[PDB]
Protein backbone atom coordinates (compact mmCIF):
# COMPACT_ATOMS: atom_id res chain seq x y z
CA UNK A 1 0.00 0.00 0.00
CA UNK A 2 2.88 2.32 -0.78
CA UNK A 3 3.52 4.31 -3.93
CA UNK A 4 7.06 4.87 -5.11
CA UNK A 5 8.35 8.15 -6.53
CA UNK A 6 11.49 10.00 -7.66
CA UNK A 7 11.94 19.46 -3.75
CA UNK A 8 12.99 22.73 -2.11
CA UNK A 9 11.65 26.23 -1.38
CA UNK A 10 13.01 29.44 -2.93
CA UNK A 11 16.49 28.46 -3.99
CA UNK A 12 19.82 30.28 -4.32
CA UNK A 13 21.94 30.29 -7.48
CA UNK A 14 24.87 32.47 -8.55
CA UNK A 15 24.53 34.39 -5.27
CA UNK A 16 20.91 35.15 -6.22
CA UNK A 17 17.52 33.74 -5.21
CA UNK A 18 15.53 31.82 -7.82
CA UNK A 19 11.74 31.26 -7.70
CA UNK A 20 10.01 28.07 -6.63
CA UNK A 21 6.64 27.95 -8.40
CA UNK A 22 7.27 29.76 -11.70
CA UNK A 23 8.57 27.95 -14.71
CA UNK A 24 12.13 27.51 -15.87
CA UNK A 25 12.30 30.34 -18.42
CA UNK A 26 11.12 32.90 -15.87
CA UNK A 27 13.58 31.47 -13.37
CA UNK A 28 16.51 31.91 -15.74
CA UNK A 29 15.42 35.43 -16.71
CA UNK A 30 15.13 36.38 -13.04
CA UNK A 31 18.77 35.39 -13.19
CA UNK A 32 19.73 38.81 -13.96
CA UNK A 33 17.80 40.25 -16.87
CA UNK A 34 18.88 37.82 -19.58
CA UNK A 35 16.55 37.13 -22.48
CA UNK A 36 13.57 34.82 -22.38
CA UNK A 37 14.48 33.16 -25.65
CA UNK A 38 18.07 32.99 -24.38
CA UNK A 39 16.79 31.00 -21.43
CA UNK A 40 14.77 28.91 -23.88
CA UNK A 41 18.04 28.22 -25.70
CA UNK A 42 19.81 27.30 -22.45
CA UNK A 43 16.95 24.99 -21.55
CA UNK A 44 17.36 23.23 -24.89
CA UNK A 45 21.09 23.07 -24.09
CA UNK A 46 20.07 21.19 -20.97
CA UNK A 47 17.58 19.11 -22.97
CA UNK A 48 15.19 19.83 -20.09
CA UNK A 49 11.41 19.93 -20.25
CA UNK A 50 10.48 23.61 -20.52
CA UNK A 51 7.23 23.70 -18.57
CA UNK A 52 8.39 21.91 -15.45
CA UNK A 53 7.94 23.67 -12.11
CA UNK A 54 10.87 25.24 -10.24
CA UNK A 55 10.29 22.91 -7.30
CA UNK A 56 11.34 20.00 -9.51
CA UNK A 57 14.56 19.79 -11.57
CA UNK A 58 17.40 18.53 -9.36
CA UNK A 59 20.88 19.86 -8.57
CA UNK A 60 22.84 18.14 -11.37
CA UNK A 61 20.83 19.78 -14.14
CA UNK A 62 20.95 22.95 -12.01
CA UNK A 63 24.76 22.90 -12.02
CA UNK A 64 24.82 22.06 -15.73
CA UNK A 65 22.86 25.28 -16.28
CA UNK A 66 25.29 27.04 -13.92
CA UNK A 67 28.22 25.93 -16.08
CA UNK A 68 26.44 27.07 -19.24
CA UNK A 69 25.52 30.50 -17.86
CA UNK A 70 28.97 31.16 -16.41
CA UNK A 71 30.47 30.14 -19.78
CA UNK A 72 28.42 31.83 -22.52
CA UNK A 73 31.34 32.33 -24.93
CA UNK A 74 32.35 28.66 -24.68
CA UNK A 75 29.33 26.68 -25.92
CA UNK A 76 28.96 28.87 -29.03
CA UNK A 77 26.40 31.29 -27.59
CA UNK A 78 26.31 34.80 -29.09
CA UNK A 79 26.48 38.05 -27.18
CA UNK A 80 22.99 39.11 -28.21
CA UNK A 81 21.81 35.97 -26.50
CA UNK A 82 24.01 37.54 -23.84
CA UNK A 83 24.05 41.33 -23.60
CA UNK A 84 24.53 72.76 -15.92
CA UNK A 85 27.06 75.36 -15.08
CA UNK A 86 26.49 75.71 -18.82
CA UNK A 87 23.07 76.87 -17.64
CA UNK A 88 24.96 79.17 -15.27
CA UNK A 89 26.69 80.49 -18.38
CA UNK A 90 23.41 81.12 -20.17
CA UNK A 91 21.77 82.85 -17.20
CA UNK A 92 24.81 85.10 -16.87
CA UNK A 93 24.58 85.78 -20.61
CA UNK A 94 20.90 86.60 -20.15
CA UNK A 95 21.41 89.07 -17.30
CA UNK A 96 24.28 90.83 -19.08
CA UNK A 97 22.28 91.23 -22.29
CA UNK A 98 19.32 92.64 -20.41
CA UNK A 99 21.52 94.97 -18.38
CA UNK A 100 22.83 96.33 -21.68
CA UNK A 101 19.43 96.83 -23.26
CA UNK A 102 17.55 98.33 -20.33
CA UNK A 103 20.54 100.65 -19.82
CA UNK A 104 20.45 101.84 -23.44
Amino acid sequence: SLVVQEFQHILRLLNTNVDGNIKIVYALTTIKGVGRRYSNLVCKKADVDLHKRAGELTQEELERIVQIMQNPTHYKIPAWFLNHTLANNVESKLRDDLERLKKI
Binding site: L41, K76, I77, P78, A79, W80, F81
Partner: protein, 247 residues
Protein backbone atom coordinates in the same frame (compact mmCIF):
# COMPACT_ATOMS: atom_id res chain seq x y z
CA UNK B 1 57.63 47.53 -45.56
CA UNK B 2 56.29 50.90 -44.49
CA UNK B 3 52.75 49.62 -44.04
CA UNK B 4 53.43 47.90 -40.73
CA UNK B 5 55.21 51.01 -39.44
CA UNK B 6 52.29 53.27 -40.28
CA UNK B 7 49.90 50.68 -38.94
CA UNK B 8 51.55 50.29 -35.55
CA UNK B 9 51.83 54.06 -35.18
CA UNK B 10 48.16 54.63 -35.89
CA UNK B 11 47.24 51.72 -33.63
CA UNK B 12 49.19 53.25 -30.77
CA UNK B 13 47.79 56.71 -31.19
CA UNK B 14 44.28 55.46 -31.61
CA UNK B 15 44.30 53.87 -28.21
CA UNK B 16 45.91 57.08 -26.98
CA UNK B 17 43.59 59.72 -28.45
CA UNK B 18 40.26 60.27 -26.68
CA UNK B 19 38.14 60.85 -29.75
CA UNK B 20 39.95 58.08 -31.57
CA UNK B 21 39.27 55.59 -28.80
CA UNK B 22 35.61 55.13 -29.61
CA UNK B 23 35.65 53.65 -33.14
CA UNK B 24 36.29 50.07 -34.17
CA UNK B 25 37.34 49.44 -37.78
CA UNK B 26 39.90 50.37 -40.43
CA UNK B 27 39.15 51.84 -43.84
CA UNK B 28 41.30 51.44 -46.94
CA UNK B 29 41.56 54.08 -49.65
CA UNK B 30 42.30 52.75 -53.09
CA UNK B 31 42.62 55.69 -55.45
CA UNK B 32 42.44 54.50 -59.02
CA UNK B 33 43.74 56.46 -61.95
CA UNK B 34 40.58 56.57 -64.02
CA UNK B 35 37.21 56.65 -62.29
CA UNK B 36 35.15 53.53 -62.11
CA UNK B 37 32.40 54.15 -64.61
CA UNK B 38 29.89 52.30 -62.46
CA UNK B 39 27.11 54.49 -61.17
CA UNK B 40 26.68 54.03 -57.45
CA UNK B 41 23.89 52.07 -55.88
CA UNK B 42 23.71 50.42 -52.46
CA UNK B 43 23.90 46.80 -53.62
CA UNK B 44 27.03 46.08 -51.63
CA UNK B 45 29.11 43.74 -53.73
CA UNK B 46 31.02 41.30 -51.60
CA UNK B 47 34.70 40.33 -51.69
CA UNK B 48 36.13 37.15 -50.13
CA UNK B 49 38.86 36.72 -47.55
CA UNK B 50 40.88 33.55 -48.00
CA UNK B 51 42.97 33.51 -44.85
CA UNK B 52 40.97 35.13 -42.10
CA UNK B 53 37.35 35.42 -41.08
CA UNK B 54 36.36 38.86 -39.90
CA UNK B 55 33.26 38.66 -37.76
CA UNK B 56 31.26 35.89 -36.21
CA UNK B 57 27.63 35.08 -37.07
CA UNK B 58 27.42 33.79 -33.53
CA UNK B 59 28.34 37.25 -32.37
CA UNK B 60 26.41 39.72 -34.47
CA UNK B 61 22.88 41.05 -33.92
CA UNK B 62 20.95 40.32 -37.12
CA UNK B 63 17.76 41.74 -38.52
CA UNK B 64 16.13 39.85 -41.40
CA UNK B 65 13.66 41.60 -43.68
CA UNK B 66 11.57 39.37 -45.92
CA UNK B 67 8.72 39.26 -48.42
CA UNK B 68 5.04 39.70 -47.57
CA UNK B 69 3.26 36.79 -45.94
CA UNK B 70 6.26 35.82 -43.81
CA UNK B 71 4.53 32.71 -42.54
CA UNK B 72 6.76 30.31 -44.41
CA UNK B 73 10.07 31.99 -43.77
CA UNK B 74 9.36 32.79 -40.13
CA UNK B 75 8.25 29.34 -39.10
CA UNK B 76 10.99 27.63 -41.06
CA UNK B 77 13.95 29.67 -39.96
CA UNK B 78 12.65 29.46 -36.42
CA UNK B 79 11.95 25.73 -36.42
CA UNK B 80 14.93 24.45 -38.38
CA UNK B 81 17.22 24.80 -35.27
CA UNK B 82 20.25 25.19 -37.52
CA UNK B 83 19.12 28.80 -37.75
CA UNK B 84 16.90 29.06 -34.67
CA UNK B 85 19.80 30.54 -32.75
CA UNK B 86 20.85 32.66 -35.71
CA UNK B 87 18.55 35.64 -36.30
CA UNK B 88 17.63 38.19 -33.72
CA UNK B 89 14.56 39.42 -35.54
CA UNK B 90 12.39 38.50 -38.53
CA UNK B 91 10.16 41.20 -40.00
CA UNK B 92 8.12 41.46 -43.16
CA UNK B 93 8.08 44.89 -44.74
CA UNK B 94 4.40 45.45 -44.13
CA UNK B 95 5.08 45.06 -40.43
CA UNK B 96 8.17 47.19 -40.70
CA UNK B 97 6.26 50.10 -42.17
CA UNK B 98 3.27 49.62 -39.87
CA UNK B 99 5.40 49.40 -36.75
CA UNK B 100 8.45 51.62 -37.16
CA UNK B 101 7.98 55.25 -38.07
CA UNK B 102 9.49 58.42 -36.63
CA UNK B 103 12.65 57.77 -34.60
CA UNK B 104 11.85 54.26 -33.45
CA UNK B 105 13.72 53.77 -36.69
CA UNK B 106 16.83 55.25 -35.15
CA UNK B 107 16.24 53.02 -32.15
CA UNK B 108 16.44 50.08 -34.54
CA UNK B 109 19.58 51.54 -36.13
CA UNK B 110 21.43 51.74 -32.87
CA UNK B 111 20.03 48.42 -31.66
CA UNK B 112 20.81 46.09 -34.58
CA UNK B 113 24.29 45.28 -35.76
CA UNK B 114 23.63 43.99 -39.29
CA UNK B 115 20.59 44.04 -41.53
CA UNK B 116 19.95 41.53 -44.28
CA UNK B 117 17.06 41.71 -46.71
CA UNK B 118 15.45 39.47 -49.22
CA UNK B 119 16.78 40.04 -52.68
CA UNK B 120 13.47 41.11 -54.18
CA UNK B 121 12.63 43.49 -51.36
CA UNK B 122 15.93 45.35 -51.10
CA UNK B 123 15.03 47.82 -53.80
CA UNK B 124 11.78 48.75 -52.12
CA UNK B 125 13.38 49.04 -48.72
CA UNK B 126 15.12 52.56 -48.59
CA UNK B 127 11.86 54.27 -47.70
CA UNK B 128 10.82 52.23 -44.69
CA UNK B 129 14.22 51.63 -43.16
CA UNK B 130 14.81 55.28 -43.63
CA UNK B 131 17.66 57.53 -44.52
CA UNK B 132 20.05 57.30 -41.67
CA UNK B 133 20.82 53.73 -42.61
CA UNK B 134 22.17 54.82 -45.95
CA UNK B 135 25.21 56.57 -44.46
CA UNK B 136 28.54 55.28 -45.67
CA UNK B 137 29.29 51.60 -45.56
CA UNK B 138 28.35 50.92 -41.99
CA UNK B 139 24.82 49.48 -41.97
CA UNK B 140 23.98 49.13 -45.62
CA UNK B 141 21.53 46.24 -45.67
CA UNK B 142 22.91 43.40 -47.75
CA UNK B 143 20.77 41.12 -49.93
CA UNK B 144 20.49 37.34 -50.02
CA UNK B 145 18.82 34.80 -52.22
CA UNK B 146 16.47 32.85 -50.03
CA UNK B 147 14.67 30.09 -51.92
CA UNK B 148 17.50 29.08 -54.29
CA UNK B 149 15.16 28.96 -57.28
CA UNK B 150 15.31 30.80 -60.58
CA UNK B 151 12.17 32.35 -62.06
CA UNK B 152 12.19 31.21 -65.61
CA UNK B 153 10.41 33.82 -67.70
CA UNK B 154 6.60 33.57 -67.79
CA UNK B 155 6.60 30.96 -65.05
CA UNK B 156 5.10 31.11 -61.59
CA UNK B 157 8.23 30.75 -59.47
CA UNK B 158 7.76 28.45 -56.50
CA UNK B 159 8.05 29.97 -53.02
CA UNK B 160 10.27 27.93 -50.74
CA UNK B 161 13.12 28.30 -48.27
CA UNK B 162 16.14 26.23 -47.24
CA UNK B 163 17.78 27.17 -43.96
CA UNK B 164 21.04 25.47 -44.82
CA UNK B 165 21.51 27.73 -47.81
CA UNK B 166 20.54 30.85 -45.94
CA UNK B 167 23.00 30.14 -43.14
CA UNK B 168 25.63 29.42 -45.74
CA UNK B 169 25.10 32.85 -47.27
CA UNK B 170 25.14 34.58 -43.96
CA UNK B 171 28.31 32.78 -42.99
CA UNK B 172 29.85 34.10 -46.19
CA UNK B 173 28.72 37.66 -45.45
CA UNK B 174 29.88 37.62 -41.90
CA UNK B 175 33.18 36.00 -42.76
CA UNK B 176 34.41 38.43 -45.40
CA UNK B 177 33.85 42.03 -46.45
CA UNK B 178 32.30 44.16 -49.15
CA UNK B 179 32.88 47.25 -51.25
CA UNK B 180 30.47 49.53 -53.08
CA UNK B 181 31.14 51.15 -56.45
CA UNK B 182 31.65 54.81 -57.28
CA UNK B 183 31.31 57.15 -60.18
CA UNK B 184 34.58 58.65 -58.92
CA UNK B 185 38.05 57.18 -58.44
CA UNK B 186 38.59 56.91 -54.67
CA UNK B 187 36.95 54.21 -52.60
CA UNK B 188 37.42 52.93 -49.09
CA UNK B 189 36.61 49.40 -48.06
CA UNK B 190 35.91 48.27 -44.54
CA UNK B 191 38.52 45.93 -43.14
CA UNK B 192 39.96 45.03 -39.79
CA UNK B 193 38.63 45.50 -36.35
CA UNK B 194 40.45 46.89 -33.34
CA UNK B 195 40.57 44.13 -30.77
CA UNK B 196 39.67 41.16 -32.77
CA UNK B 197 42.73 40.45 -34.91
CA UNK B 198 46.15 41.80 -35.58
CA UNK B 199 48.76 43.11 -38.01
CA UNK B 200 49.53 39.98 -40.09
CA UNK B 201 45.83 39.23 -40.42
CA UNK B 202 45.13 42.72 -41.64
CA UNK B 203 48.13 42.80 -43.96
CA UNK B 204 47.15 39.57 -45.68
CA UNK B 205 43.60 40.90 -45.82
CA UNK B 206 44.83 44.02 -47.59
CA UNK B 207 46.80 41.97 -50.08
CA UNK B 208 43.83 39.73 -50.86
CA UNK B 209 41.52 42.72 -51.25
CA UNK B 210 43.74 44.54 -53.70
CA UNK B 211 44.37 41.29 -55.51
CA UNK B 212 40.66 40.61 -55.93
CA UNK B 213 39.93 44.16 -56.99
CA UNK B 214 42.73 44.03 -59.54
CA UNK B 215 41.81 40.54 -60.77
CA UNK B 216 41.04 40.88 -64.45
CA UNK B 217 38.43 38.16 -64.23
CA UNK B 218 35.23 37.95 -62.14
CA UNK B 219 33.84 40.74 -64.26
CA UNK B 220 30.90 42.02 -62.15
CA UNK B 221 33.01 41.92 -59.00
CA UNK B 222 36.67 41.23 -59.75
CA UNK B 223 37.46 43.01 -62.99
CA UNK B 224 36.35 46.39 -61.70
CA UNK B 225 39.32 48.72 -61.22
CA UNK B 226 40.25 50.49 -64.44
CA UNK B 227 43.52 52.37 -64.73
CA UNK B 228 46.62 52.49 -62.61
CA UNK B 229 46.20 52.01 -58.88
CA UNK B 230 47.79 54.97 -57.14
CA UNK B 231 47.68 54.60 -53.38
CA UNK B 232 46.05 53.09 -50.29
CA UNK B 233 45.66 54.99 -47.06
CA UNK B 234 44.93 53.23 -43.87
CA UNK B 235 42.78 55.01 -41.33
CA UNK B 236 39.94 54.46 -38.97
CA UNK B 237 36.89 56.72 -39.10
CA UNK B 238 37.80 59.77 -37.02
CA UNK B 239 41.50 59.63 -37.86
CA UNK B 240 43.86 61.18 -40.33
CA UNK B 241 44.93 59.02 -43.25
CA UNK B 242 48.18 57.06 -43.35
CA UNK B 243 49.83 56.79 -46.75
CA UNK B 244 50.91 53.52 -48.34
CA UNK B 245 52.27 52.59 -51.77
CA UNK B 246 52.53 55.82 -53.76
CA UNK B 247 53.61 54.26 -57.02
Amino acid sequence: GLAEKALKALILQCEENPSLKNDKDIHIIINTGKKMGINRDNIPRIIPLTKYKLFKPRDLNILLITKDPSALYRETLTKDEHTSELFKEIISVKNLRRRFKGSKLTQLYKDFDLVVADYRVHHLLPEVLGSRFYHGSKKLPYMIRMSKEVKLKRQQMVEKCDPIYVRAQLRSICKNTSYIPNNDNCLSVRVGYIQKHSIPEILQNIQDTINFLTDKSKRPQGGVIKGGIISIFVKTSNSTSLPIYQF
